[PDB]
């Protein structure tokens, strides 16, 4: 029996308890699992497919217990126009309002060419004045009209994801893991990492003087990286040479949901020296001003943040976070596997924080080792983590670098950074009018490999006003296909109007769900 | 109007007429299409195997139903490539030798899907059982119902034409060419010009402006497709584009073929291609109604044309001086670039490998499909051309590396040929994939549960196709997937899957018509 007998997870929160619950189910009680534990969060839609569905927790159950709201997109306010941050969208050089959506809805195709490409043709040839988001996604109409992505009878209308309270999801999962899945919770500080002759972790020593013996160690200890970085001496690779923000300042804002209604989407509100998220939940919205401390002091950032929402700076409670941007040289060294902030991090601009946790966990269960820790098993895991991370890093860079804004040392400095080759090649592709990572769907392997696809690139490039040099040349030969595409643009308008009518509001569906 | 107005395709056969017909439909009569095909001295119909996307990606785009094109080219069904005597040594025979461990030296590469338990493919459960002596089934028979059906020579459809398994096609290349030509000429406006090309007229930049024919006629053009075969008369000669020889990866460079009349009532018809291993290469067997096409692929460095012809005739009991043979020398590799200036290469003029996994035609409609997607106007955006070139090299190198693995992990070392294969360097791509496989991990999991052409082309050789070949040749993981040691419920779920396979195979080996009976119905 060469098997792992005991997994010790250091640290709780989302990262530790997601790890404990997933490994609980994955390893079928053949392995003892121990956790050692002393603003709002947006997600992407595979969270139910790839995590809660594996645990066999239905969506309503976990939603009800963590004050969960619906998310149909990230919406980008004032990313093109200059000046101080505001929740009200400014008006562009060409007159229109500086808002663009990145929804989770699919793009339909004619003649095996996505609708994105027909719209580009029309826009480039002056034959429409519609923005991409409005013309191509029914979702957009629905988000403008603050509607829910399900009917009251809970028939699905669009694809969607989730806003929630991180700490409440942790709490729900801990409880799940302890009661339903044999996980031992140990409330105590870690004070020493005991390591054998080979540099493997043998145990964690607690403050109470107890030792937690182990075989595999999961570091969910946050940015401190107490196992992967400190104990194991694995270097962390700084990537503020790709993304400038390194600091945030957050709070919850009580919100009149009867008066205003609830936005079924995350809002990225552009700012002096960074941006500010807005994550609607029932009764309150979480918000945080992400910034670079090289381009704005903690105070400058806090004043601007309070100003945005009309909050009293000395009458309001703030969380101040410095964060690493980058990733470990390797996620997994000897018998230390890193997950969440201890592994890698990026500003939550496209809501990748939680995706990274269950991506890592999923890959850990697949590459789960015995005690020989086969080098290849560990390597293949490390490889998947770096590809995953670098991809999402390069996508985020694109958000900044192709912003037209040059009205602040921050916004200008973004354009002084080197584009990674991957995103340079993709832009060159996009400019020729070609698609960029055509999606492989009309299992989680498919979702994770091909994660940012054609539609997500049009959403951001188009949204920021980067366009192809010219239409896709093939379109100049496909008059029947152009025609078929109009009937698709029509189908979109019809779908959006029939649903903006018949759908309940977000607010009405939340009220039902939480009662 | 900066558009291409005229496409000139040089050469006919599968490549030229597939290009003419596809571009005919794709470009919706906004472009004049001309084919320039030499007068054709009839060869013997040596048979062509395909992969299953042929109907989805090509005939269905043209809106030609499967039965129509099948009836017109004497088409038979193909459920796998079956590999006879790739592990045991000695002279070629259609009868499989017996291994030291008492199994018969046959393994299948079918088109069937692998089910998963606990997000782990069945291949991995079978490896666990095999490694731990808890089964003596080979991978193919344990995991694919298709295998039982192929052993029992059954059809992949019932007589009522309900589908039973996945499948592809055997046919006469020249007859498909003929059917398509006729399609393209009558139903799609294509002008057919029967004549030799003698001159490639080029502008100041080396772009092709026209082709001159032998009759002295001049064929003006905007885009030129070279479907001229290995001679590469536009892409290689006229355009001076170098071809990259890759006999540093695959040794065969010659074949010798014929059609063999076959007693279908006596023996039945095999619903599969057979790769029969040989002295200095291998021999395909492509069953059609009444006859099977066969060819002994060989390396001319390890066997003379004669040696090869004697061995080939010996195999099937054919009289060497009383039988009609086609002799082919072929280049193995690909152009430095498929598409230079306004000359796009398709088929043998683009790139080629021995038809070991039946990739010949796939390469043609892959290229054609990518041409329609990257179709240019007259400014020939160099990025459009580059992106196309990139897709063709990745596609080719992938299938090259797959084929290498067929030879390199053969245990055979009983002939200068078989030993020389082991002296070649593995490409890094396939070295990394073997290292992966050996740790017990999967190799390119498919993106299909049970789709659009993007999915098929990117992820073309997947986990199941790697197990089929590695396992089939007896390369196995160093040990089981370690995760399996923690998932007893998952192991259990997998047995119900192995059972579902046995059940499926026995119910169908009973209820299915024979291949022979379905062909007879189809060819009324
Ligand atoms: N590549 C297969 C389908 C396929 C497409 N062209 C082929 C040409 C030869 C054989 C198979 C195929 C796939 O996607 N999945 C299977 C492999 O048998 C799996 O479950 O791994």
What whole-number distance in Å separates Cα of residue B6 and Cα of residue B224?
9
Cα(A350)–Cα(A370) distance, integer angstroms: 36
* Interchain contact A374–B (C-beta under 8 A): yes
Most A CBs within 10 A among B1, B433, B482, hence the mutation to make, goes to B482
Q: How would you label B269-286 residue by residue, b for 16+ Cβ within 10 Å and e otherwise?
A: bbbbbbbbbbbbbbbbbb
Does A366 reach chain B within 8 Å, measured CB to CB?
A: yes
Q: A171 labelled as ligand-binding?
A: no
Report the C-alpha gap between A198 and A172 in whole angstroms: 38
Cβ distance of A442 and B435 shorter than 8 Å: no
Residue with tokens 């195997």: B49
Please, which residues 31-50 of chain A have a Cβ atom closer than 8 Å to chain B? 31
Question: Is the separation of the CB atoms in A274 and A289 below 8 Å?
Answer: yes
Q: Quick one: three-class SS letters along B391-441?
A: HHHHHHHHHHHHHHHHHHCCCCCCCHHHHHHHHCCCCHHHHHHHHHHHCCC
B377, B482, B488 ranked by CB distance to A476: nearest = B377
CA nearest B5 in A: which residue?
A477
Query: Collapsing DSSP states into helix, strand and coil, what is residue A248?
Result: strand
DSSP bridge pairs for B257: B295, B326
B186 part of contact set with chain A, CB < 8 Å:
no
Task: Answer yes or no: do A479 and B30 touch at CB < 8 A.
Answer: yes
Nearest to B439 among A30, A374, A439 (CB): A374
A71 is catalytic: yes
How far is B92 from B84, CA to CA, in rounded Å? 9
Resolution, given in Å to one decimal, reads 3.0
Distance from Cα B465 to the centre of ligand 1, integer Å = 6
Say if residue A455 carries a ligand binding annotation: no
Q: Which of B5, B32, B78, B378 is catalytic?
A: B78
Question: Is residue A211 classed as helix, strand or coil in its secondary structure?
Answer: strand
Do residues A282 and A506 make contact, with C-beta atoms less than 8 angstroms apart?
Answer: no
Chain A and chain B share a number of CB contacts under 8 A equal to 113
List the residue whose alpha carbon is closest to atom 8 of ligand 1.
Answer: B51
- Check whether A352 is labelled as a binding-site residue: yes
Ligand 1: does its nearest atom lie under 6 Å from the Cβ of B445? no
The Cα-based distances of B144 to A206, B130, B472 in angstroms read 53, 16, 13
Q: Is the CB of residue B448 below 6 angstroms from any atom belonging to ligand 1?
A: yes
Partners of B224 in beta bridges: B8, B343
Q: What single-letter DSSP state applies at residue A276?
A: E
> CB of B462 closer than 6 A to ligand 1?
yes
Strands B243-245 and B223-226, by their bridges, are unpaired
- What secondary structure letter does DSSP report for B242? P
Tokens at residue A180, please?
């339903």
Strands B197-202 and B191-194: unpaired
- Residue A286, H or E segment: strand A284-291
Q: Is B485's CB within 8 Å of A449's CB?
A: no
- φ/ψ of residue A343, rounded to 5: -85, -55
Could you tell me which of B273, B246, B254 has the C-alpha nearest to residue B311? B254
Test the A interface: residue of B128, B447, B477 with most A CBs within 10 Å: B447
CB of B465 shorter than 6 A to ligand 1:
yes
Which residues, in sequence order, are CB contacts of A85 under 8 Å at separation 6+? A78, A269, A270, A271, A272, A276, A289, A304, A307, A308
At residue A18, the 3 state secondary structure works out as helix
Residue numbers in A near B437 (CB within 8 A): none
Do B27 and A434 make contact, defined as CB atoms within 8 angstroms? no
Q: Whose CA is nearest to atom 5 of ligand 1?
A: B460
CA separation for the pair A241, A236 (Å, rounded): 14
Q: How far apart are CA B259 and CA B286, in angstroms?
A: 9
User: What distance in angstroms lies between residue B66's CA and the mean position of ligand 1's atoms?
Assistant: 21
Separation between Cα atoms, residue B230 and residue B27, nearest integer Å: 27
HEC string of A326-370 equals: EEECCCEECCEEECHHHCEECCCCCCCHHHHHHHHHHHHHHCCCC
* Exposed e or buried b per residue across A429-441, where buried means at least 16 C-beta atoms within 10 angstroms of its C-beta: bbbbbbbbbbbbe
Task: Give the tokens for residue A148.
Answer: 């829910």
Alpha helices in B132-172 (DSSP H): 139-143, 145-151
The reply to whether residue A376 touches residue B489, judged by beta carbons under 8 angstroms, is no
**Given the DSSP bridges, would you call strands A201-206 and B191-194 parallel, antiparallel or unpaired?**
unpaired
Of these residues, A5, A25, A71, A375, which one is catalytic?
Answer: A71
Measured CA to CA, the distance from residue B270 to residue B292 in angstroms comes to 10
Identify all chain A residues contacting B368, using CB atoms and an 8 Å cutoff: none
- Relative to the CA of B109, which ligand 1 atom is closest? 10
CA dihedral sign of residues B364, B365, B367, B371:
positive
Cα of B431 vs centre of ligand 1, distance in Å, is 20
Greatest pairwise CA separation for chain A in angstroms? 77
Question: Which residues of A fall within a CB distance of 8 Å from B60?
Answer: none
Give me the residues of A, 465-504, that contact B with CB < 8 A.
Answer: 469, 473-474, 476-481
Q: Does A124 contact B at CB distance below 8 Å?
A: no
**Helix, strand, or coil (residue B241):** coil
Query: Looking at ligand 1, which residue's alpha carbon is closest to its atom 16?
Result: B464
Quick count: other Cβ atoms within 10 Å of Cβ A195?
16
Which region, left, alpha or beta, applies to residue B118 given φ > 0 means left and ψ of -120 to 50 means alpha? left
Which residues does chain B have within 8 Å of residue A365's beta carbon, measured at their own beta carbons?
483
Ligand 1 contact via B453 beta carbon (within 6 Å): no
């Amino acid at each position: 029996d060469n098997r792992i007998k005991t997994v010790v997870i250091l640290g709780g929160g989302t990262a530790g308890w997601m790890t404990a619950a997933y490994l609980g189910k994955a390893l079928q009680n053949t392995v003892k699992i121990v956790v050692l534990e002393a603003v709002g969060e947006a997600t992407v839609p595979n969270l139910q497919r790839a995590f809660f569905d594996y645990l066999g927790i239905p969506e309503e159950e976990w939603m009800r217990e963590c004050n969960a709201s619906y998310k149909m997109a990230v919406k980008f306010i004032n990313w093109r126009t200059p000046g101080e941050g505001s929740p009200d969208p400014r008006t562009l050089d060409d007159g229109h309002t500086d808002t663009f959506h990145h929804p989770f809805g699919l793009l339909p195709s004619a003649d095996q060419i996505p609708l994105s490409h027909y719209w580009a043709a029309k826009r480039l040839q002056g034959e429409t004045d519609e923005n991409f988001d409005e013309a191509c996604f029914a979702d957009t109409a629905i988000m403008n009209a603050k509607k829910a992505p399900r009917f009251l009878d809970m028939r699905r209308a669009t694809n969607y994801a989730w806003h929630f309270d991180a700490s409440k999801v942790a709490a729900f999962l801990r409880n799940f893991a302890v009661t339903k899945q044999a996980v031992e919770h140990v409330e105590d500080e870690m004070t020493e990492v005991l390591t054998d002759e080979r540099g493997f972790i043998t145990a964690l020593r607690t403050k109470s003087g107890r030792i937690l013996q182990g075989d595999l160690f999961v570091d969910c200890s946050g940015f401190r990286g107490l196992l992967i970085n400190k104990a194991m001496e694995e270097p962390f690779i700084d990537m503020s040479d790709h993304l400038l923000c390194n600091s945030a300042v957050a709070t919850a804002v009580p919100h009149d949901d009867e008066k205003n209604g609830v936005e079924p989407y995350t809002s990225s509100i552009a700012m002096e020296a960074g941006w500010t998220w807005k994550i609607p939940m029932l009764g309150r919205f979480g918000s945080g001003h992400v910034y670079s401390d090289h381009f704005a002091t903690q105070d400058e950032a806090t004043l601007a943040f309070s100003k945005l929402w009309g909050l009293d700076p000395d009458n309001t409670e703030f969380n101040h976070v410095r964060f690493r941007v980058g990733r470990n040289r390797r996620a997994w060294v000897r018998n230390c596997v890193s997950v969440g902030l201890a592994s890698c991090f990026v500003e939550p601009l496209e809501s990748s924080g939680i995706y990274f946790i269950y991506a890592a966990i999923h890959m850990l269960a697949k590459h789960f080792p015995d005690k020989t820790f086969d080098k290849v098993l560990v390597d293949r895991f490390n490889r998947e983590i770096e590809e995953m991370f670098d991809d999402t890093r390069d996508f985020l860079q694109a958000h900044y670098y192709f912003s037209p804004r040059v009205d602040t040392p921050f916004w200008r400095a973004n354009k002084e950074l080197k584009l990674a080759d991957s995103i340079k090649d993709k832009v060159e592709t996009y400019r020729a009018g070609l698609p960029v990572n055509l999606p492989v769907t009309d299992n989680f392997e498919a979702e994770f490999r091909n994660f940012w696809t054609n539609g997500s690139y049009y959403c951001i490039f188009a949204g920021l006003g980067l366009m192809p040099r010219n239409p896709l040349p093939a379109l100049a030969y496909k008059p029947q296909s152009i025609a078929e595409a109009e009937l698709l643009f029509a189908d979109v308008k019809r779908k959006g109007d029939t649903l903006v009518e018949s759908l309940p509001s977000t607010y009405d569906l939340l009220r039902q769900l939480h009662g």
